[PDB]
Amino acid sequence: AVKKVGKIIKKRTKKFTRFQSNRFMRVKPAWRKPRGIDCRVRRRYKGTNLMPSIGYGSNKKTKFLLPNNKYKYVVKNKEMEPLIMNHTKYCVQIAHNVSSKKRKQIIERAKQMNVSVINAKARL
Amino acid sequence: VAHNNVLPNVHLHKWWQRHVRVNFSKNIKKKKRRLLREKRRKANGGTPIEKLH
Amino acid sequence: AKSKNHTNHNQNRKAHKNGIKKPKKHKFMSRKGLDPNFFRNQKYCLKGIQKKKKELKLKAKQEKNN
C-alpha cells in the first residue's frame, strides 16, 4: 500500500525480491529480470512476485528528499564549506571510515553551523 | 560470405602462429646501431668511416 | 519428414504492414530505344532551337557588354 507522510508521497514499499528466491538458497534476494520462456513472472500471472517497472517512480518534485524534507550529503574530513548557504536543504552524514577525533571535530563544527547530522552517535 | 562485401582474400589458411614475429626492439636496435657506429668511428683516429661513391 | 509444400497465409498483411508502395512517377521518360527515325529528327529540332536561342543570347550579351 502507498504510504503518505506529510508531503513526500511514496507509492511502494517492500523492496522487491527475486522470483524463486524463497525455496532456493543459491538465489540471493537481489532482484533480477528473469528471462526464461514459460517463466510465469514474464507472463505476469495473477498475483505472483510482481516485477518493478517505471510507473512506481516517485515524483521528481520530491524524489530524492529524505523524511527530513532535506537531501542528504556525505562528508569526510572538513568539507563543510559548500554547506553554509543551503543549511535548510542539505543534511550531512559522516562517512563510515572516519575516526573518532575527526568525527568529533566535524560534529562540533556542524552543531554550531546548525545543520542536522544523521549518525551523530557513531563509534562513541 | 554475407551480401555486399569484398570477396575475402585472406592468405592465413596455413599455420602462422609458428611464424609470427613482431618487432618491439626497433628503437633500442637503432640506439645500439648508433652506439656501435659511433665507437667504430671514434676508434679510427677521426678518419670518417663513410666512403666516396 | 513431411514438409508443407506451399502457403500464402499472412502475405497480404505483411505487404500492407509497410503500406502498398507506389512508383515514384517521375516526369520525363527516357527515349533510349523508342521508335527511332522520329526522335532522330527531334534531336536536330532541339539542337536548332537551342542554337538560335543561344546565338541570340550571345548577340544580346555582346551588344549590352560593348
Binding site: 529480470k33 528471462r35 | 560470405v1 551480401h3 555486399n4 570477396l7 575475402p8 | -
Partner: protein, 147 residues
C-alpha cells in the same frame, strides 16, 4: 576499449544476440567462399557478376615498370607553376612559361580542360594526345618532344 562492445549489453540473455531457434553454429553455410555455383550462387550473381570465367590473353612477366606513365590533364598546367609567376606571365605579352613536366614527375599530357585564350605555353613531355596538341596549338602554344 572492451566494455563498448555490443556483447557487453546482452550478458543476461541466454542467446547472446545470436538467435535462439536457429542457434549459433560453427560455419553454417560452409567455410570460405564455398557456395559458388552450387547454393550461394545467387549472391555472386547479384553482387559480383563477372567473377567467374577467364577472359583475355596472357602477359607472362608484365614488369609493370615499363608501361608506367602518370597522367596530367592540360588545364592543370598553369596550376603547376606558382601563382606569382602565373601573374607575371599573364601580365607580359612577350614571355611564355616552359614546363618540363619530367621535373615534376609527370609523363603524359591529356586534353581535358580549358586553357586561357590568347596565351602561348611551351610544354615538354614524353607523350602527348591529339586533342591536347590541338588545344595547345590553338592558342599559340607549342608541343616539344623530350626523352
Amino acid at each position: 576499449a572492451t566494455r563498448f562492445k555490443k556483447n557487453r549489453k546482452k550478458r543476461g540473455h541466454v542467446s547472446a544476440g545470436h538467435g535462439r531457434v536457429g542457434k549459433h553454429r560453427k560455419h553454417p553455410g560452409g567455410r570460405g567462399k564455398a557456395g559458388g555455383l552450387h547454393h550461394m550462387r545467387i549472391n555472386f550473381d547479384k553482387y559480383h557478376p563477372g567473377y567467374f570465367g577467364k577472359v583475355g590473353m596472357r602477359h607472362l612477366n608484365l614488369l609493370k615498370n615499363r608501361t608506367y606513365c602518370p597522367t596530367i590533364n592540360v588545364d592543370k598546367l598553369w596550376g603547376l607553376l606558382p601563382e606569382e609567376k602565373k601573374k607575371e606571365f599573364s601580365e607580359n605579352k612577350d614571355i611564355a612559361p616552359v614546363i618540363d613536366v619530367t621535373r615534376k614527375g609527370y609523363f603524359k599530357v591529356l586534353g581535358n580542360g580549358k586553357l586561357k585564350h590568347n596565351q602561348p605555353i611551351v610544354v615538354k613531355a614524353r607523350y602527348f594526345s591529339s586533342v591536347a596538341e590541338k588545344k595547345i596549338k590553338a592558342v599559340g602554344g607549342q608541343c616539344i618532344l623530350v626523352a
